[model samples]
Target: SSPGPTCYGYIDDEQDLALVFQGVFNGNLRCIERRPYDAEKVELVNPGNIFVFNEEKSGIKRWTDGFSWSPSRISGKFLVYREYNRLGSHNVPEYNIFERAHRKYFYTGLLKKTFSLKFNMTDSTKLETFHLIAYYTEKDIHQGSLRRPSENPFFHKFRPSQKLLDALQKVAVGNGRSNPS
Candidate 1:
């Protein structure tokens, strides 16, 4: 027997884990892991049932093994990412619609996340009971970017890994209205 990895298995909410999605606007981004990892010791990345990654690399490579698992039943749920945009990026009357619609907030070599959601006649009301993973920009502050003094709950808008985001969309990347594909 030998001294195994100090930390193994699912990342806990009590840890300092941060997930950054790079090049999101380009629609071709990778999920970069930036959490409380101890490189000085042997560790294991247990991609258990809770988390899913596409491909991991950093002088090494990792993949997810298929398991006999089935997802639960759910409906019209969208993703949310932490936005770190410049304050007043669209506060000018002369600015066009596209200017205001500019969400190229893809990290400039840094990132984290959440998103603003709105509802219409489609009906977006349901019971939510699932673990929603969130990642944050390491060492950031909670100040107003642009608001009418809006108390932007500057805590857990915790973003997710690119793969998780992709899967969420992929399940909704359909023509249906409610049910997840």
Candidate 2:
């Protein structure tokens, strides 16, 4: 016997789900089946949810996150590469665009490759876009899909404005003023 088709949605948080039920339901508690991604899948995948990379001279900058997974990959002639190590090895090189998230909050142990190439910094007008798709399941197999587009397309540009650098310096200058041992 078949239990019928299932649907999945990515809710940002528990409170958000509560609001969803509140908006859609009568005053009664309801149950929804929650399927966990297999533990093996969890172990095998380190989602590159946030991406940011910059090459100062070339004016290459890209940044995006899970809420709006934009600039999914880099569009460039640079050889795309991947490494099991934090620092990628130079054994073979294939072209790809997009860089790893370098911020403390965004670093995955895996060094997901980015679009920066050592070859040429300046070349063309860099613009790219992508979308998230929700696939339809037929007997638990994805057959078709729908699109989730970014609210805005991410454009490449230089990062760390002078104002940002000044703020960082301000924090460093006041590091111990807030507390002392």
Candidate 3:
């Protein structure tokens, strides 16, 4: 099964189950058109728990661990985007009605394209779950049940267990330093 928009769900970290639960995201690149295309970027991360892009820079911004996970959950007003790269590859050029107001976050296309945070739902505050809103665009190429070797094209969210969170915190951050974006 290719990674879909819902890879972010919690499962017993030990149990071996779904296709996602048995794969790994190797940080490799497929050189194409004389440029290194990050094909191995986001894929099976923690099996039934988390998934991420091993491409680009080693996992994604917020998909690998839990140090930044808490901030990911937004209870108050927030803004998120999909279908755009980290460099705002395909963002709308026209000024938006929302842009006038402070935007919490923008250009999360890379974020959506990489990583999955399975909330526990048991603990609403930290692992607060949100119904993932799917915004399909021309760029979205849906890969069905067919499994692409070393590739899963799905990314989405759900609640996970506290045990899962604790486990994630293990390799959360290397030195609590901001990544070079």
Best by lDDT: 3
Query: Which regions of candidate 1 deviate over 4 angstroms?
Result: 1-63, 71-74, 77-154, 157-171, 179-181
Q: Residue 127, candidate 3: how far off, in angstroms? A: 16
Model 1, residue pairs in steric clash: 80-114, 80-115, 81-113, 81-114, 81-115, 82-113, 82-114, 134-158, 135-159
Give the TM-scores of the predictions, in the order they appear: 0.19, 0.17, 0.22
Arrange candidates, best TM-score first.
3, 1, 2
lDDT of 2: 0.25
Task: Tell me the deviation in Å of residue 8 in model 2.
Answer: 18
lDDT, candidate 2, at 142: 37
Which scores greater on lDDT, model 2 or model 3? 3
Ranking by lDDT: 3, 1, 2
C-alpha lDDT of all candidate models, in order: 0.26, 0.25, 0.28
| CA RMSD (A), model 2 | 20.8
Worst 10 residues of 1 by lDDT: 112-121
In the order shown, what is each candidate's alpha-carbon RMSD?
Answer: 20.2, 20.8, 14.0
Positional deviation of residue 32's Cα in model 2 after best superposition, in angstroms: 38
Regions more than 4 Å wrong, model 2 = 1-45, 57-78, 85-111, 117-181
* lDDT tens readout by residue for model 2, 73-167: 32121111222223342332233233457621221222232222221213574522211112111222232232112211111121223433342
